[PDB]
PDB file of C-alpha atoms and ligand atoms in Angstrom:
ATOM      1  CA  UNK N   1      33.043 136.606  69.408  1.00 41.69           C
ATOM      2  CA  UNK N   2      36.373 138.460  70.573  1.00 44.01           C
ATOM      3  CA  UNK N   3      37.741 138.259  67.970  1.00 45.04           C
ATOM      4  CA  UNK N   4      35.172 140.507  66.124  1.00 42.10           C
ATOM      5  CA  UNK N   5      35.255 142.779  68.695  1.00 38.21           C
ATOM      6  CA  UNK N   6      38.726 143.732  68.730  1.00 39.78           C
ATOM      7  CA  UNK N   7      38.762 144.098  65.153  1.00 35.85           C
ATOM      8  CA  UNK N   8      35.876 146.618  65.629  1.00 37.52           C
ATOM      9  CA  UNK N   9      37.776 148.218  68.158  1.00 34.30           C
ATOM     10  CA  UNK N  10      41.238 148.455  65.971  1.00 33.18           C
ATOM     11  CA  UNK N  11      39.116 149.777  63.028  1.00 33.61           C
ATOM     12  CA  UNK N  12      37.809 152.808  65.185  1.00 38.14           C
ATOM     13  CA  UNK N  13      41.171 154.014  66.187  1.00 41.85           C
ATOM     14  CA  UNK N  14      43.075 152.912  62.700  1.00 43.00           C
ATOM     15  CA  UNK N  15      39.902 155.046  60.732  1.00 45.48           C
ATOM     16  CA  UNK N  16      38.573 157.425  62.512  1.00 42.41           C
ATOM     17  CA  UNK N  17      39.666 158.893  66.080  1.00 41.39           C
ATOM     18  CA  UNK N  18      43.290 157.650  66.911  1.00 39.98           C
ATOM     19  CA  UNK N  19      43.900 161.035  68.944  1.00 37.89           C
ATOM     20  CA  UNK N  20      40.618 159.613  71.764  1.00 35.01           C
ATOM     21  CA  UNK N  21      43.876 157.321  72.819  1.00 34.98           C
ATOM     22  CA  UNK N  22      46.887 158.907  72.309  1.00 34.44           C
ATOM     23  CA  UNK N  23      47.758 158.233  69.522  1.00 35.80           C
ATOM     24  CA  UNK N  24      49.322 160.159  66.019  1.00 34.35           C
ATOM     25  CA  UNK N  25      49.055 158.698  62.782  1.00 37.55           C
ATOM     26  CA  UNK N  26      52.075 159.407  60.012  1.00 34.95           C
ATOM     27  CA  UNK N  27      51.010 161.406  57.147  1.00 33.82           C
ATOM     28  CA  UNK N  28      50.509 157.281  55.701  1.00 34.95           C
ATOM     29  CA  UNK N  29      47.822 156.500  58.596  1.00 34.22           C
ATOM     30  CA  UNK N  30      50.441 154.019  60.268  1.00 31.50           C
ATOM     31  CA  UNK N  31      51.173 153.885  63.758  1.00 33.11           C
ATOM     32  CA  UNK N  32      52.965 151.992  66.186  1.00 32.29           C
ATOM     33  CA  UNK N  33      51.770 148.228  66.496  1.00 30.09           C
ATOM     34  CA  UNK N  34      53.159 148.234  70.381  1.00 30.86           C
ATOM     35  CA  UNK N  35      50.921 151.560  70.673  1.00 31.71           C
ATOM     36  CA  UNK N  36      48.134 149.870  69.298  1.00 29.36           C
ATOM     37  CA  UNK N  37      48.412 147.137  71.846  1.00 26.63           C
ATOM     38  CA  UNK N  38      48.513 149.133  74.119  1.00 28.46           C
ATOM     39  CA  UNK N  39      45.370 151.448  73.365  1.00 29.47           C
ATOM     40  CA  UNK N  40      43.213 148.297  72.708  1.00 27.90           C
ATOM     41  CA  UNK N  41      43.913 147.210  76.575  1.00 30.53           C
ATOM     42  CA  UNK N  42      41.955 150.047  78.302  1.00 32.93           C
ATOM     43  CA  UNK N  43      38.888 148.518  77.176  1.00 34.85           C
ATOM     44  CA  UNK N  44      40.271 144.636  76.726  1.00 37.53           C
ATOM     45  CA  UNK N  45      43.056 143.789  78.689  1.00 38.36           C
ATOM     46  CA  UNK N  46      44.033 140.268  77.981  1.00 35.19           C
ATOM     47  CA  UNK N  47      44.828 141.336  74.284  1.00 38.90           C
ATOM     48  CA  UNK N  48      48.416 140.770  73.168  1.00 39.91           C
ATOM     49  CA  UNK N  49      50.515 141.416  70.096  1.00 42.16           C
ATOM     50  CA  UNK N  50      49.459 137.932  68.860  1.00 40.44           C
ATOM     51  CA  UNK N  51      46.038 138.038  68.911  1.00 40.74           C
ATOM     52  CA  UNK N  52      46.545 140.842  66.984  1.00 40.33           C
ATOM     53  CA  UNK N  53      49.219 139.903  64.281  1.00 40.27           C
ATOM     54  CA  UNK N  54      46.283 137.257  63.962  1.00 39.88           C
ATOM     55  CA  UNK N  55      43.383 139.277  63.147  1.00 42.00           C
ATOM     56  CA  UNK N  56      45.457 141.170  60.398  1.00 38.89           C
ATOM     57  CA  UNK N  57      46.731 137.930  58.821  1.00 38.43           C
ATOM     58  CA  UNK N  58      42.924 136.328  59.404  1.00 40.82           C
ATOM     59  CA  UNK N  59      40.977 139.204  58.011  1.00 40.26           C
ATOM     60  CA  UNK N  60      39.060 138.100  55.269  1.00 39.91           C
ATOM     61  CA  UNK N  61      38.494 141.620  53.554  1.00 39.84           C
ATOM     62  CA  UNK N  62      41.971 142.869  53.883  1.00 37.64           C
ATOM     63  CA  UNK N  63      41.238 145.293  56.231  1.00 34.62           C
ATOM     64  CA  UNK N  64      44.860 146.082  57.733  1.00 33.74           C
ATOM     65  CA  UNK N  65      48.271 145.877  56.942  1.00 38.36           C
ATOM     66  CA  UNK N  66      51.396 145.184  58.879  1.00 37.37           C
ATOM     67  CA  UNK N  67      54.707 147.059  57.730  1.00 38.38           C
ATOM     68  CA  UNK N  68      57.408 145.112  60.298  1.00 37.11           C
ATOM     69  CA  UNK N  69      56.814 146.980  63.750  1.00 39.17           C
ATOM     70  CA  UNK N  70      53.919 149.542  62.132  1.00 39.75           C
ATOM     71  CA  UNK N  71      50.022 148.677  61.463  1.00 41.53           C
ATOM     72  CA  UNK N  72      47.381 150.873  59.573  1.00 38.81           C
ATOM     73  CA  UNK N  73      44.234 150.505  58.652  1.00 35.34           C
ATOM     74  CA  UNK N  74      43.698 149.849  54.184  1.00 39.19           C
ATOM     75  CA  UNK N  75      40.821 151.898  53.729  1.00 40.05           C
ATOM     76  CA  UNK N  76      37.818 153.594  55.699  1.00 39.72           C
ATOM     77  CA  UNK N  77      39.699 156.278  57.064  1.00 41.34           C
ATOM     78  CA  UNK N  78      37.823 159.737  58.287  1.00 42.04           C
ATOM     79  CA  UNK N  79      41.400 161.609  58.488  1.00 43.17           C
ATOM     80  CA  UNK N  80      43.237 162.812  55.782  1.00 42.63           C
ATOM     81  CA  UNK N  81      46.192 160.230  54.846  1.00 42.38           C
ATOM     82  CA  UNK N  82      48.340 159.526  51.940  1.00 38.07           C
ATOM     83  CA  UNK N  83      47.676 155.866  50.806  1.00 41.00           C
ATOM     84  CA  UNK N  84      50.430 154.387  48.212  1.00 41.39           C
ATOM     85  CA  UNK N  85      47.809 151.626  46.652  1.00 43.63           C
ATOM     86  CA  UNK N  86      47.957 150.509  43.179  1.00 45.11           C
ATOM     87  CA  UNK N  87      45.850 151.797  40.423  1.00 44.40           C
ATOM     88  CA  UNK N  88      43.154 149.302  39.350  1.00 42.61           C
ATOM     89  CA  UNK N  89      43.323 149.903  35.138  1.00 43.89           C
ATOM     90  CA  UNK N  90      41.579 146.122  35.130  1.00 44.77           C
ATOM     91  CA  UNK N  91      38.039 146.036  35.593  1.00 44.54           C
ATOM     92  CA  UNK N  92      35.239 147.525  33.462  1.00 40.21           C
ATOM     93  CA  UNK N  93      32.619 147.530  36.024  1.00 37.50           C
ATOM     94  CA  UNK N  94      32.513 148.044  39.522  1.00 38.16           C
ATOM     95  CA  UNK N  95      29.740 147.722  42.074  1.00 36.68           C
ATOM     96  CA  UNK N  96      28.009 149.511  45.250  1.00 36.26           C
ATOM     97  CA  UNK N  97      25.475 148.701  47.797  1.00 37.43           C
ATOM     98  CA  UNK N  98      23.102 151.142  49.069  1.00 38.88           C
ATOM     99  CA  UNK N  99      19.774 151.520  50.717  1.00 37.76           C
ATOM    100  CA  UNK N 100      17.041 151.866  48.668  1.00 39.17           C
ATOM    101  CA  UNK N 101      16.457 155.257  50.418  1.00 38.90           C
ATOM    102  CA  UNK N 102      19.555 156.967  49.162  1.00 37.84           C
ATOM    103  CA  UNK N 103      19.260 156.611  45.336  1.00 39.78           C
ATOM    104  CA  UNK N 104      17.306 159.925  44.882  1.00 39.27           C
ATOM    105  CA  UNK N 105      20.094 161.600  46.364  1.00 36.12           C
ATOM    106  CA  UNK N 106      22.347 159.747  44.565  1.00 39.16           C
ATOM    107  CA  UNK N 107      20.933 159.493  41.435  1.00 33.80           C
ATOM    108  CA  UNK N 108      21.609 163.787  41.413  1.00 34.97           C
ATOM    109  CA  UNK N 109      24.777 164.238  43.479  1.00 33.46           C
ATOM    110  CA  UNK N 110      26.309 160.796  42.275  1.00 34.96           C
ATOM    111  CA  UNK N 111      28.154 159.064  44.508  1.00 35.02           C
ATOM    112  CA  UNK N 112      30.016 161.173  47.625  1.00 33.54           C
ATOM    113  CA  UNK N 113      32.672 160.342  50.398  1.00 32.72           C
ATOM    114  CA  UNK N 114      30.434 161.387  52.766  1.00 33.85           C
ATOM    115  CA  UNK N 115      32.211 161.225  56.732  1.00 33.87           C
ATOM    116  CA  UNK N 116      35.059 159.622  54.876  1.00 32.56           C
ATOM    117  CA  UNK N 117      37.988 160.575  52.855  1.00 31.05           C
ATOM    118  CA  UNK N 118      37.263 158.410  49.445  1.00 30.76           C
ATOM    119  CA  UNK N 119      34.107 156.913  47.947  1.00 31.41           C
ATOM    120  CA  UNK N 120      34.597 152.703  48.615  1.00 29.85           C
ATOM    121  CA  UNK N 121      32.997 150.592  45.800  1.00 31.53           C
ATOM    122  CA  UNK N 122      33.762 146.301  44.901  1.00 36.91           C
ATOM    123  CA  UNK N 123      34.776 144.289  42.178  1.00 36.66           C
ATOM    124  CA  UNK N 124      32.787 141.812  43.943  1.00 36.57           C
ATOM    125  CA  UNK N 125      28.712 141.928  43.572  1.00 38.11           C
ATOM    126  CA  UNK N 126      28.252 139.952  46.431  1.00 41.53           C
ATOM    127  CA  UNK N 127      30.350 142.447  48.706  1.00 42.32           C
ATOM    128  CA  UNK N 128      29.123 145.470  47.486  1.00 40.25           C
ATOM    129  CA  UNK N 129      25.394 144.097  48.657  1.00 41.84           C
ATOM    130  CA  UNK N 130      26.640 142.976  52.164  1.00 40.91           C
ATOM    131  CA  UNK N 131      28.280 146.349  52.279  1.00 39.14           C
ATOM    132  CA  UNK N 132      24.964 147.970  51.723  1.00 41.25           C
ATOM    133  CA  UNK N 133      23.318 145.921  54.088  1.00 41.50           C
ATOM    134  CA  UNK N 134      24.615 147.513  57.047  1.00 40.45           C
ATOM    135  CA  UNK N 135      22.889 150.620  56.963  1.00 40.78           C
ATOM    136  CA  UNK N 136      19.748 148.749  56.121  1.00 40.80           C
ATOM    137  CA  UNK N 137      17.566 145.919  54.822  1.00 38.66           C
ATOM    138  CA  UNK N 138      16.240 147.309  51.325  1.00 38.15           C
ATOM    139  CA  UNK N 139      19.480 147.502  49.614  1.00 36.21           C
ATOM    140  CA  UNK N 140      19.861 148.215  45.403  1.00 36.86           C
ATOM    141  CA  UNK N 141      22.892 147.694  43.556  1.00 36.60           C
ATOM    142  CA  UNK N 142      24.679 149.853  41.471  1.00 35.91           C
ATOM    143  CA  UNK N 143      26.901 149.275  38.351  1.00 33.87           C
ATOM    144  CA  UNK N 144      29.476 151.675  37.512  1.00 30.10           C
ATOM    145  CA  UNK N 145      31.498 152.097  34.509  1.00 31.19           C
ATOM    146  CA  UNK N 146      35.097 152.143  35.608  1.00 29.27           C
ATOM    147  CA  UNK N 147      36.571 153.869  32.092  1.00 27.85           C
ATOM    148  CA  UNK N 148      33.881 156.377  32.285  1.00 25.77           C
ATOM    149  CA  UNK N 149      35.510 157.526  35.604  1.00 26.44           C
ATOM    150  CA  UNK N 150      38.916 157.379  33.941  1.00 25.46           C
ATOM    151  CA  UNK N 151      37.954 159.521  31.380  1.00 24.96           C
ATOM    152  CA  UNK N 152      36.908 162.064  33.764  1.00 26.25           C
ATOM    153  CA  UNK N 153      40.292 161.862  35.689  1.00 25.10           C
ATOM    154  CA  UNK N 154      38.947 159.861  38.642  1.00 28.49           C
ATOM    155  CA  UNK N 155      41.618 157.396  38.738  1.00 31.78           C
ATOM    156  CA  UNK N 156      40.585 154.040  41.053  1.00 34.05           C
ATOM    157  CA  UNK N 157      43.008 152.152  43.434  1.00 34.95           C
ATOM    158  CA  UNK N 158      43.423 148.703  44.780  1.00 38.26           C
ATOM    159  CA  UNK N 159      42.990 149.452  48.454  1.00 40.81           C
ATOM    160  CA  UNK N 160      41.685 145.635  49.362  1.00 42.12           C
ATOM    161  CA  UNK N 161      41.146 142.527  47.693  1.00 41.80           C
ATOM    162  CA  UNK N 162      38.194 143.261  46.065  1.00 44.42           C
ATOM    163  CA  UNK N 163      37.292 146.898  47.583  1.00 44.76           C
ATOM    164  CA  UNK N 164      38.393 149.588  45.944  1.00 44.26           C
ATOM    165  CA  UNK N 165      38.271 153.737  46.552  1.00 45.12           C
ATOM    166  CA  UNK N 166      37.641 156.870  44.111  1.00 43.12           C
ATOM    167  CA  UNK N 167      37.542 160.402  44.895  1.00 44.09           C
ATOM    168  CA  UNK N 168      34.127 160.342  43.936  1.00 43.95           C
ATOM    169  CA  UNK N 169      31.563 158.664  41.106  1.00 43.78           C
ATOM    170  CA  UNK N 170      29.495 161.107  39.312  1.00 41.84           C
ATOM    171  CA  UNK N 171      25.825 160.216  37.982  1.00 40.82           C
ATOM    172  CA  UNK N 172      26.626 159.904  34.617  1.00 38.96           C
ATOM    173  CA  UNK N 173      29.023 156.850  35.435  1.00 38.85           C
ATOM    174  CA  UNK N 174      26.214 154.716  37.176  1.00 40.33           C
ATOM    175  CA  UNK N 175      24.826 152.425  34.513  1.00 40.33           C
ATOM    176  CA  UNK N 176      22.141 150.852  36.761  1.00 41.08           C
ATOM    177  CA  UNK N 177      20.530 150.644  39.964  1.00 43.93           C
ATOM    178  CA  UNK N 178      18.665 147.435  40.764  1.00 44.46           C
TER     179      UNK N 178
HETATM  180  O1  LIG K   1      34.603 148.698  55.365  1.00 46.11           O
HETATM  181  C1  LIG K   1      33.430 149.443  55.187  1.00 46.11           C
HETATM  182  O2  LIG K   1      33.707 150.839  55.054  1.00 46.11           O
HETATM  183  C2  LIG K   1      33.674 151.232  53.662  1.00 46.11           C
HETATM  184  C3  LIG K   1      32.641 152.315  53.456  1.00 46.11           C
HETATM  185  O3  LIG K   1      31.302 151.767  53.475  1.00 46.11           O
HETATM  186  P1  LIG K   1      30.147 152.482  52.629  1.00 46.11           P
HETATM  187  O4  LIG K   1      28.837 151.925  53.028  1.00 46.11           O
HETATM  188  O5  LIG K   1      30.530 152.469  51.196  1.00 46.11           O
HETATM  189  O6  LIG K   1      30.235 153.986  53.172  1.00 46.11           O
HETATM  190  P2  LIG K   1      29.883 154.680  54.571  1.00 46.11           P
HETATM  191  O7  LIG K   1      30.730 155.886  54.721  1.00 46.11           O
HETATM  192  O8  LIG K   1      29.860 153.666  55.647  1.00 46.11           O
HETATM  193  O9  LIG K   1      28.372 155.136  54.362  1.00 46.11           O
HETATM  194  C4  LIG K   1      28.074 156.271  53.531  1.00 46.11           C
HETATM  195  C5  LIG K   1      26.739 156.008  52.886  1.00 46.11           C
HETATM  196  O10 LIG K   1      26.336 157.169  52.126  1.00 46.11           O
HETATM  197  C6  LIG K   1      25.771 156.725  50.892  1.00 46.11           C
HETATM  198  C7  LIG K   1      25.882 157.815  49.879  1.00 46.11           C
HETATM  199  C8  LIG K   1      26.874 158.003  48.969  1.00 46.11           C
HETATM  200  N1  LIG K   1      26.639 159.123  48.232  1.00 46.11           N
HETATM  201  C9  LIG K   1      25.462 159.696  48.653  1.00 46.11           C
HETATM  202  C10 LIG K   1      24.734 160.837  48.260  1.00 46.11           C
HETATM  203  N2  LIG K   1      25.120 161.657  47.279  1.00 46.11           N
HETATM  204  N3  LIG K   1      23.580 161.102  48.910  1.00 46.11           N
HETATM  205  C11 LIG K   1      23.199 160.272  49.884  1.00 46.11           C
HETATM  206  N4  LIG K   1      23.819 159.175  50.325  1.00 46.11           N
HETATM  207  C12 LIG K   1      24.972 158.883  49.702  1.00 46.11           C
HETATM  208  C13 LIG K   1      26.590 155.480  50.551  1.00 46.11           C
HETATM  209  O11 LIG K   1      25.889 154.657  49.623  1.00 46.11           O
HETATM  210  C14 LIG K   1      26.698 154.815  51.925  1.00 46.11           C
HETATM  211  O12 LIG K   1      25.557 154.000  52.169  1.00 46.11           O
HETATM  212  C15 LIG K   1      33.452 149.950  52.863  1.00 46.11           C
HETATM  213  O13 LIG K   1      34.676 149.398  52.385  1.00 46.11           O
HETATM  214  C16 LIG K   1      32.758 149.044  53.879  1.00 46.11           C
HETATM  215  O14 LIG K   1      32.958 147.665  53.582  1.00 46.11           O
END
């Protein structure tokens, strides 16, 4: 229960409008954890440092990431920021969940970043439809060839466990949609 809604709360400032409480990312999207603290209390005040070094080492998706006394969000952001991830020169395929309702779109422009800075996909099938399920109920699944987006200089980088981001996924490298 509170715990999900501070998390919701630190992924809005970490991803998208840090500035709304005073805050300036480094060019790396950290910031300071004690500012953090801080910035969650004006809308829950009995949140401490604890509670949150807790939700970063709980998260299941690998959402954040504690550097000693810093804490930025992995992935998601809507600013400009220079990430330092590892390439991911593993998998063959990778995976995305959309509604149903986008693949005309999609299935012309490819895949785009849209509000955000990189286009997310999974290693993980199951993720990727979850993922889609958030914008809506009739979800399809799409396969991606990972060398063919190599090929074409779109490298891909470990940004969680199993999420991963790319500039951007052109038509030709989605193998299916079901
Ligand atoms: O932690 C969460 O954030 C990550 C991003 O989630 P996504 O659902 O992948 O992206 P999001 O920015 O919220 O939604 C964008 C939305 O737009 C669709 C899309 C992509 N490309 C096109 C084109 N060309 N036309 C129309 N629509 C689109 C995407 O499929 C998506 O639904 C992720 O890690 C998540 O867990």
């Amino acid at each position: 229960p509170e715990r999900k809604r501070v998390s919701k709360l630190m992924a809005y400032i970490l991803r998208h409008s840090p500035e709304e409480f005073g805050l300036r990312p480094d060019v790396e999207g950290f910031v300071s954890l004690n500012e953090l603290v801080n910035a969650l209390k004006t809308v829950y005040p009995e949140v401490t440092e604890e509670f949150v070094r807790e939700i970063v080492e709980n998260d299941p998706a690998g959402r954040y990431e504690i550097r000693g006394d810093r804490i930025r969000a992995r992935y998601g952001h809507s600013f400009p920021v220079s990430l330092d991830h590892e390439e991911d020169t593993e998998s063959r395929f990778l995976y995305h969940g959309t509604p149903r309702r986008n693949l005309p779109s999609i299935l012309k422009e490819g895949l785009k970043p849209m509000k955000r800075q990189y286009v997310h996909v999974s290693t993980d099938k199951i993720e990727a439809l979850e993922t889609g399920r958030r914008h809506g109920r009739e979800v399809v699944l799409l396969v991606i060839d990972a060398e063919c987006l190599r090929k074409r200089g779109f490298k891909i980088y470990k940004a969680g466990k199993n999420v991963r981001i790319v500039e951007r996924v052109p038509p030709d490298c989605i193998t299916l949609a079901v």
